[PDB]
Every structure is written in structure tokens, then in C-alpha cells.
């Protein structure tokens, strides 16, 4: 759980399967399935299904177009 927080927040697993030998095996020890070699699943904020164009109270004070 700590190791995956490092991958999530610090890019510990940036190099994917190119991770150096000792780190990879330590990760293999903690994560036996090897799925960590596929980096963390990062979300993308582009083209999100339903997030577009909301106008709050302060936003309503500028309102171009």
C-alpha cells in the first residue's frame, strides 16, 4: 500500500519494466503479480463526460459571452 502510494504520488515506477533490478524485485516481493510494471492509472481531465462549463456565484460576476 505504501509502495503504490510512491508510484502514484512520486513516480517510483516511472520506468515501467525498465525499473532497475533491485527496486523491481523489491516491488515484485510486495506485488507478486507484477502488475506494477504497468504504471499507475492516471486520470485525464480532457473530454470528461459531464463536467463542462458550470458558473458559480463568483464566476457569474465576469461571464464573457
Amino acid at each position: 500500500e505504501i509502495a503504490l502510494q510512491f508510484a502514484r504520488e512520486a513516480g517510483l515506477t516511472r520506468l515501467k519494466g525498465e525499473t532497475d533490478y533491485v527496486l523491481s524485485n523489491v516491488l515484485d516481493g510486495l506485488i507478486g503479480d507484477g502488475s506494477w510494471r504497468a504504471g499507475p492509472a492516471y486520470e485525464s481531465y480532457l473530454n470528461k463526460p459531464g463536467v463542462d462549463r458550470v458558473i458559480t456565484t463568483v464566476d457569474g460576476l465576469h461571464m464573457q459571452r
Binding site: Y42, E43, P49, V51, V54, T56, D59
Partner: protein, 370 residues
């Protein structure tokens, strides 16, 4: 009949001792008009309290008189108390002893001024200030257990064994619901939803209450939200605009277990409860582990009880049986306990009476109340 008023940082739970639930529950807010004029006929009251403030929030600045368990505006607090007695419970305080509550490790002046105001401006025949964790244990029907009480203002742990508190093992954490509301505001801007005003803080609090949940495995939920839209839920704002919220649903409550999310150098509620237990005598730890009692609104997130079990189990020795007690009415458990306490015949001598207040002054509250 005694009056039981649980003045939390967020909500005023008030009612009568012996009842199954508080008669009046309303926000602990005083609102004042921040806009101009302009019509004469409407009367234009200068200040609003509670539900009236909440409904008119569009044109008010909302102020909480209690910050992290501490009364910070005594004028507004007296407004909230006058509203509780005369407008909500419709009682004459001169006729009822009043049981108040407050979190442990509060400033001592806070206790004294509550006593002074109740006896001097409300002329209660008697009063009492209780500890919310102790009242929650009363409401659980137990005499042993460590209560994790988390409301709007502060989270605190009180370990109790056979009715005896271990005050050296009490843990207090000013990370509570309001800080989670503020954090959600911060991360809601990541999707373009910028809430700023106090009225909009109330909307964000509403979003938190019915969309946020605690993740059992934070990394797993993060991966799920990244790779799918199955965790995304929508919320309609008062003006009809719809916001869609994804991993912010479980990232907001996650702050309770990773206070470094909001820049707080403290351990999460799981490790604080475990640290409280370990500060207790080795011979009572087994019973505390099996009697973790959740209390307060901030413990109402879906999945928080199961997360606390996983977390406390990961810290404790494997042979310990960890049990998290999360009753459905844990939001009112504190008021429920006060209702039980004030009803007991054996408690009827514990009241601070007006005579004792007169001889001793407000300092009597320290001598006669934990």
C-alpha cells in the same frame, strides 16, 4: 424536565431529557444581510439564526459562532441559545436544568462562560457540562470502550474502562467535518467548480454529505476512477447547474486517514485511535479494541467503519479482535447520551445549581464537571 443541548461546531441538537431524539436540530450559524436595502415593507430583520439563516443564505454572510469546538463569538452564540430555547423548544429556561456538552481538552474559559451565560442571562435553575465522548458511550449502553467522536469541529478519542476514563490517553484532532468541506472546495476546483462564498460552502457541505464516501483501498479506488467513469456521480446545484464529481468523492474523506492531504502534520483517525489505545493500560487494551465506538456526523461517510476496521487491524496485534461500533443514529448519539444522563435519578445531584454558582461563580464548572 431537563433540557439537553448538544452545541456542536456544525449543528445545534436540542431537546428534552428522556426523549428518543432531539426535538430541534438546526445549523449552528448566524447570518447577516450583506446586500443593500431596499424595500421598506418587508421589515428587514438585521440577523438570522439557524434554519432561517440557511434558507436566506443567498443574501447573507454565514458565520459559525463555534470554531473547532470553541465558542469564538459569544454574542452570536447567545443568539443561537436564545433561538434554541424560545423559538425551537419554546421553553422558559428559568424552569429547566440545562445539560451542555463540549469536546475534551477545550480552553477552560469556554466552559466558564457557558456556565456564566446560562445562569446570568438565561437564569437556568441548574446546569451541567458533559464530555461528548462520554455521552456517546452512555448512548451506546456501554461502560467500556474508546469513543471516536468526529463532528464538524474536532475529532477526539476518549478511552473508558468500566466507567473510568484515562484522561492522559485522550486524543484530540482539530481535523473534522469543516476541514473536509474546505478540502472538497479546494479539489472541486480541479474540475472547474469554484465555490467561494459561505453560502456556497454550505452547498459544498451538502455535496460532501451525500456523495462522499470512504474508500477501503485508496489506491484501488484511484485506479478504478482513472480507468472508468463508474465512480462518477452528478449533483444539481440550487440554480439548476449540474456538477459531476469523480475521485473527489473518496479523496475528501481520505483526508481523515491522510491528514497530510490538507497540510496537517498529524496521524489519521485510525492511527490516533490506535495511539490512544496503546497509551492505555495493557490490561484494558483488548476490551478497548473490541469496543471502538463511532460518533458524530463526520463518522457518517459510507465505508468509514469498514475502513477503520481494516486500519486498526493493520496496526494492532493479529490476535486482537477489532470491532468498530457504528450505530445508525451515531449522529445523535451524543445528544442521546445527554438525554439518558440527565434522566437518571442518580445524576440529579451532579447538577451545578444556581446557589452553588452564586457562592463560587462560574469556576464551579471546573470542580463539578469533567
Amino acid at each position: 424536565t431537563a433540557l439537553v443541548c448538544d452545541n456542536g461546531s456544525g449543528l445545534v441538537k436540542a431537546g428534552f431529557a428522556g426523549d428518543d431524539a432531539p426535538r430541534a436540530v438546526f445549523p449552528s450559524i448566524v447570518g447577516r444581510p450583506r446586500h443593500q436595502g431596499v424595500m421598506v415593507g418587508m421589515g428587514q430583520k438585521d440577523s438570522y439564526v439557524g434554519d432561517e439563516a440557511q434558507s436566506k443564505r443567498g443574501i447573507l454572510t454565514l458565520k459559525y459562532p463555534i470554531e473547532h469546538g470553541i465558542i469564538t463569538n459569544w454574542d452570536d452564540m447567545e443568539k443561537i441559545w436564545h433561538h434554541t430555547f424560545y423559538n425551537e423548544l419554546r421553553v422558559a429556561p428559568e424552569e429547566h436544568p440545562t445539560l451542555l456538552t463540549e469536546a475534551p481538552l477545550n480552553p477552560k474559559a469556554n466552559r466558564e462562560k457557558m456556565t456564566q451565560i446560562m445562569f446570568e442571562t438565561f437564569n437556568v435553575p441548574a446546569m451541567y457540562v458533559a464530555i461528548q465522548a462520554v455521552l456517546s458511550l452512555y448512548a451506546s449502553g456501554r461502560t467500556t470502550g474508546i469513543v471516536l467522536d468526529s463532528g464538524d469541529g474536532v475529532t477526539h478519542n476518549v478511552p473508558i474502562y468500566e466507567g473510568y476514563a484515562l484522561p492522559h490517553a485522550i486524543m484530540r484532532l482539530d481535523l473534522a467535518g469543516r476541514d473536509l468541506t474546505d478540502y472538497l472546495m479546494k479539489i472541486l476546483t480541479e474540475r472547474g467548480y469554484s465555490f467561494v462564498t459561505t453560502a456556497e460552502r454550505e452547498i459544498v457541505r451538502d455535496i460532501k454529505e451525500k456523495l462522499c464516501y470512504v474508500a477501503l483501498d485508496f489506491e484501488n479506488e484511484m485506479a478504478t476512477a482513472a480507468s472508468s467513469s463508474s465512480l462518477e456521480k452528478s449533483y444539481e446545484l440550487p440554480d439548476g447547474q449540474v456538477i459531476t464529481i469523480g475521485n473527489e468523492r473518496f479523496r475528501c474523506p481520505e483526508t481523515l486517514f491522510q491528514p497530510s492531504f490538507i497540510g496537517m502534520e498529524s496521524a489519521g483517525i485510525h492511527e490516533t485511535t490506535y495511539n490512544s489505545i496503546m497509551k492505555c493500560d495493557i490490561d484494558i487494551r483488548k476490551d478497548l479494541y473490541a469496543n471502538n465506538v463511532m460518533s458524530g456526523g463526520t463518522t457518517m461517510y459510507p465505508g468509514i467503519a469498514d475502513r477503520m476496521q481494516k486500519e486498526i487491524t493493520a496496526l494492532a496485534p493479529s490476535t486482537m479482535k477489532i470491532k468498530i461500533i457504528a450505530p445508525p443514529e451515531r449522529k445523535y448519539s451524543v445528544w442521546i447520551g445527554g438525554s439518558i444522563l440527565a434522566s437518571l435519578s442518580t445524576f440529579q445531584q451532579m447538577w451545578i445549581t444556581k446557589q452553588e454558582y452564586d457562592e463560587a461563580g462560574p469556576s464551579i464548572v471546573h470542580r463539578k464537571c469533567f
